[PDB]
């Protein structure tokens, strides 16, 4: 398959679907460590911004070394966030709670 | 320190080698607060460098 | 409901200062933009600035953001206007006037949602 | 000058309908729907009519509504009226955390 090669930390992005059923799945459930992976049925949309609206300034360090940074903020500043529909989230979250009582 | 209430980033300033050798200007960049880590902890709290 | 008290009219000379105040009335101090145009007697109305009075935050115009140090205070609810090296052509009615909501998240400063306005104020020179 | 241009007049009998167009370029109003239409009767301060092109405030009948096309936009007046003999004014979102007005244009009811 296209294995989108996306780095994520603690939820996966973009990832393939489960075809039929939300799955758990573990190396060795009886202990802590081994990660607790869930690959869910459905998707649950996340969005995000940051609308502070920074501006490029070049500054050119040594022989034609050029080096970028923020420069100027035209605009208003406000707070970079991300959103999720609360209702299908804990409906997912529930979902997978009845699979973790498939496996507990 | 307290006007803003939302992540406003510093806005420092510093000298950078331009082309010339020998030769040096003041200039400014913003960064955000993370990347940025006091240098003492004497009352002058106004001197920083990189995290790295 | 919503008012904009703002103060009285004076005379300056050329290349002297003004200070107008515009104070609030019937909401939240906090929770809206406050706005300022300009109009000059018998002519087009022009735009000066934002505040958003939770912070020091403003906007001001290209051509008199050099001219404006408008500012505010919350104790006493209200938002300053300020002009500097005053010409003969800045002989006008200041309105102030409430803007878009503000809060988190996004920035409404753009939107022209002039609500409520002011009793606008003349300053005359010459 | 302002950035938006406006005519000078319209005039017209009451019972007519009658509207007005702004127009600016790509950028500014052209690129948002973030115009707005304010009225200056004679003395008085201006007032509230018209915002996010075709949305109306409390007070304001229905005669009033407006529309956006390219790099102008327009206020539609319909069924003139007898107090209506004032001027009105485009105003929109001219980029850069900027509002720009334009002139306005004056209608007389006939």
């Known amino acids: 398959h296209g294995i989108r090669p996306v780095v994520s930390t603690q939820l996966l992005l973009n990832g393939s679907l489960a075809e039929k059923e939300i799955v758990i799945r573990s190396e060795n459930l009886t202990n802590n460590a081994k990660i607790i992976i869930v690959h869910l049925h459905t998707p649950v949309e996340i969005v995000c911004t940051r609308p502070n609206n920074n501006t490029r300034k070049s500054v050119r360090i040594g022989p034609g070394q050029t080096f970028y940074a923020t420069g100027d903020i035209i605009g208003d500043i406000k707070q970079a966030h991300c959103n999720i529909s609360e209702e299908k989230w804990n409906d997912t979250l529930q979902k997978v709670g009845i699979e973790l009582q498939k496996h507990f | 320190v307290k006007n803003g209430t939302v992540e406003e980033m510093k806005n420092c300033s510093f000298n950078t080698t331009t082309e010339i050798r020998d030769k040096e200007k003041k200039e400014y960049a913003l960064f955000y607060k993370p990347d940025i880590v006091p240098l003492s902890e004497t009352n002058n709290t106004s001197e920083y460098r990189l995290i790295n | 409901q919503v008012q904009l008290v703002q103060s009285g009219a004076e005379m300056k000379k050329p290349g002297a200062s003004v200070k107008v105040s515009c104070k609030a009335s019937?909401?939240?101090?906090?929770?809206?933009?406050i706005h300022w145009v300009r109009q000059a007697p018998g002519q087009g109305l022009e735009w000066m600035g934002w505040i958003n009075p939770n912070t020091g935050r403003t906007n001001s115009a290209q051509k008199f953001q050099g001219r404006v140090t408008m500012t505010r205070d919350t104790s006493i609810s209200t938002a300053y206007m300020e002009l500097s090296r005053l010409t003969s052509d800045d002989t006008a009615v200041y309105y102030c006037?409430?803007?878009?909501?503000?809060?988190?998240?996004?920035?409404?400063?753009?939107?022209?949602?002039?609500?409520?306005w002011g009793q606008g104020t003349l300053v005359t020179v010459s | 000058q302002s950035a938006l241009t406006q005519p000078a007049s319209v005039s017209g009998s009451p019972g007519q309908s009658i509207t007005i167009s702004c127009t600016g370029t790509?950028?500014?109003?052209?690129?948002?729907?973030?115009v707005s239409w304010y009225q200056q009767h004679p003395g008085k301060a201006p007032k509230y009519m018209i915002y996010e092109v075709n949305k109306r405030p409390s007070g304001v009948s229905n005669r009033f509504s407006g529309s956006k096309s390219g790099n102008t936009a327009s206020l539609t007046i319909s069924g003139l009226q007898a107090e209506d003999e004032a001027d009105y004014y485009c105003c929109s979102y001219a980029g850069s955390s900027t509002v720009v007005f334009g002139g306005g244009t004056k209608l007389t009811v006939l």
């Open positions: 790509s950028y500014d109003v052209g690129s948002y729907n973030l």
């Open positions: 019937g909401y939240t101090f906090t929770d809206y933009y």
């Open positions: 006037a409430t803007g878009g909501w503000i809060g988190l998240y996004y920035d409404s400063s753009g939107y022209p949602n002039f609500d409520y």
